[PDB]
From a paper:
The second most abundant fibril morphology (morphology II) represents the majority of the remaining fibrils. Morphology II presents a left-hand twist as demonstrated by platinum side shadowing and transmission electron microscopy (TEM). Using cryo-electron microscopy (cryo-EM) we obtained the structure of morphology II, complementing our previous structure of morphology I22. The 3D map of morphology II achieved a spatial resolution of 3.5 Å, based on the 0.143 Fourier shell correlation (FSC) criterion. Morphology II is polar, C1 symmetrical and consists of three protofilaments (PFs). The PFs are referred to as PF-A, PF-B, and PF-C. The arrangement of PF-A and B in our model is relatively symmetrical and similar to morphology I. The PF-PF interface is formed in both cases by reciprocal ion pairs between residues Asp59 and Arg61. The interactions between PF-B and C also involve complementary charged residues. There are reciprocal interactions between Asp22 and Lys24, as well as a contact of Gly1 (α-amino group) from PF-C with Glu25 (side chain) in PF-B. That is, the packing between PF-B and PF-C is more asymmetrical than that of PF-A and PF-B. Alignment of the fibril proteins reveals only small, if any, conformational differences between the protein folds that construct fibril morphologies I and II.
Author numbering:
A (entry chain Q), B (entry chain N), C (entry chain K), D (entry chain H), E (entry chain E), F (entry chain B), ...: 1 to 69
The structure:
């Protein structure tokens, strides 16, 4: 099994990027969540990029190349 | 089993990047979560990049290359 | 089993990067979490980069190279 | 089993980078957590880099190279 | 078993980098945690670098090289 | 078993880098934790570097090299 | 740039399987060659086979098999 | 740049399997060659086989097999 | 740049399997070669086999097998 | 840059398996070569085998096997 | 840069397996060579085998095996 | 740069297995060579075997095995 | 190859009358050349003469004569 | 190879009359060359003469004569 | 190889009349060369003469004569 | 190899009349060369003469004569 | 190898008439060379003469004569 | 090897007429050389003469004669 959580350039309150497995006879309660923003500038940004998501990669040659300037 | 949590350039309150496994007869309670922002500048940023996520990578040659300037 | 938590350039209150395994007859309570920001500049930043996440990497040649200037 | 927690360039209150395993008949309580920021500059930053996360790396040749200028 | 906690360039209050294993009939209480910042400059920073996290590395040749200028 | 805690360039209050193992019939209480900063400059910094974390390294040749200038 | 010479189940006299390269200001003579056979039985024989000649073979998968039953 | 010479199950007299290179201001003579066979039985024989000649073979997987039953 | 000479199950007189290189101002002669066979039984024989000739072989996996039953 | 000479199950007279290099102002002669066989039984024989000739072999895995039953 | 000479199960007279290098202002002669066989039984024999010739072999894993049953 | 000479199960007269190097202003002669066999039984024999010739072998793991049952 | 370089009454910096033959895998560089001449009288002078270039001159009778005066 | 370098009444810096033969894997560099001439009289002078270049001159009778005066 | 370097009445700095043969894996450098001439009379002078370059001169009768005066 | 270096009435700094043969794995350097000439009379002078370059001169009769006066 | 270095009426600094043969794994350096000439009369002078360069001179009759006066 | 170094009427600093043969694993250095000449008359002078360079001179009759006066 493969579990991968990735996060970048974000504003959150709570409860994020959670993994629960192999459980029995459990129980849980979560809390209220409030987000309040006033007068904020130049926030929550990421620059250019690429995203690749896969299970198997086999015999990659001269690939997955990225160039900027 | 593979569990990978990654975080960069973020503003949070709580409860993030959590892994629970192999549990029995458990119980839990979480708390309220508040996020308040006023008058903030140049926040929560990441620059250019790339993301690769996979289980198996086999025989990679001259690849996964990144260039900036 | 492989568990990897990574964090960089962040502002948080609590409860982050948690791993719970192999448990029985347990119980727990968490606390409220507040985040308050006013008048803050040039915060929560990371520069250019790359992210690679995987389980197995086999026979990598002239790869996973990064260049800046 | 492999457990790896890494943190860099962050501002936190508490409860971070926690590992609990092989437990029975346990119980615990956590405390409230407050984060307050006013008038702060040039905070919570990391420069360019790369991140690699994996379980097995086999026969790596002329790879995982990083250059800056 | 392998447990590795690493921290650099951070401002915290408490409860960080904790490992609990092989426990029975235990119980514990944690305390409230407050973080307060006003008028602070050039704080919580790390320079360029790289991060590698893995379980096994086998036959690495001319790799994991980093250059700066 | 391998337990490794590393810390550099940080400002903390308490309760950090803790390892508890092989316990029975134990109990403990922790104290409140406060962090207060006003008017501080050029604090909590680390320069360029690299991080490698692993369990086994086998037959490394001309690798794990770092150069600065 | 290679020279391959393979011979099986032949009846010869001489002057066979020559590779001459990088000759300058040379000179020579080869004599005479007599072959005489009288009354021979069941000679110069080979069984079944598969013959392959090439310069470059890439990424072959589940191929070049021979079965005899 | 190599020279391979392979011979099996041959009846010869001489002057076979020569590799001459980098010769200058040379000179020579080879005599005469007589082959005479009378009344021979069951000579010069080889069984089944597979023959492969090449310069470069890359990333071969589950190939070049021979089965005899 | 190598020279390989392999011979099995041959009846010869002489002047075989020569590798001459880097010759200058040389000179020579080779005599005569007589082969005579009368009444021979069951000579010059080899069994089944697989023959491979090459210069470079890379990353071979589960290949070049021979089975005899 | 090497020279390999291998011989098995041969009936010869002489003048075989020569490697001459780096010769200057040389000179020579080789005599005559007589081969005579009468009434020989069951000579010059080899059993099954697999023959491989190469210069470079890299990262071979589970290969070059011979089975006889 | 080496010279390998291997011989098994041969009937010869002489003048075999020579390696001459770095010769200057040389000179020589080799006599005559007679081979005579009459009435010989069951000579010049070798059993099954696998033959390998190479210059460089790298990172071989679970290979070059011989089984006889 | 070495010279290896190996011989087993041969019937010879003489003039075998010579390694001459670094010769200057030399000169010589070799006589004649007679081989005579009449009525010999069951001579010049070797059993099964595996033959390997090389210059460099690196990082061999679980290989070059011989089994006889 | 015949090479006849002949020079009379000439002035140069360098790189004159060069003969390169039978070269391999060789590289070379020739620096820059300056020729400065000022205030010089009666330079680079050859008297009268005849010039002959040929390969084969057979049965020349009373020919190729130069009568001065 | 025949090389005849001949020079009379010449002025140079260097790099003249060079003959390179039978070279391999060789590299070389030739520095820069300066030739400065000022205020010089009666330089680089050769009297009268005839020039002959050939290879074969057979049965020359009363030829190739130079009568001065 | 025949090399005839001949020089008469010449002025130089260096690097003249060089013959290189039969070289391998060799590298070399030649420094820079300066030739400065000022205020000099009657330099680099050769009287009259004839020049002969050849290889074979057969049955020369009363030829190749130089009669001065 | 025949080498005839001949020099008459010449002025130099160095590096003249050099013959290199049969070299391996050798490297060398030649420093820089200066030739400064000022105020000099009657230098580098050779009287009259004839020049002969050849290899074979057969049955020369009353030839190759120089009659001065 | 025959080497004839001959020099008459010459002026130099050094590095003249050198013969290197049959060298291996050798390295060398030659320092810089200065040749300064001022105010000198009647230098580097050779009278009349003839020059002969050859290899084989057979049956010379009344030839190769120099009659002065 | 035959070496004939001959010198007449010459002026030098050093490094003249050197013959190196059959050397291995040797390294050497030659210092710098200065040649300064001022105010000198009648130097480096040789009278008339003939020059002969050869290898084989057979049946010379009344030849190679120099008649002065």
């Amino acid at each position: 099994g493969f579990f991968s959580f990735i996060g970048e350039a974000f504003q959150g309150a709570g409860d994020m990027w959670r993994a629960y497995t192999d459980m029995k006879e459990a129980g849980w309660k979560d809390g209220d969540k409030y987000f309040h923003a006033r007068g904020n500038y130049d926030a929550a940004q990421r620059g250019p990029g690429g995203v690749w998501a896969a299970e198997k990669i086999s015999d990659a040659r001269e690939s997955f190349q990225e160039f900027f300037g």
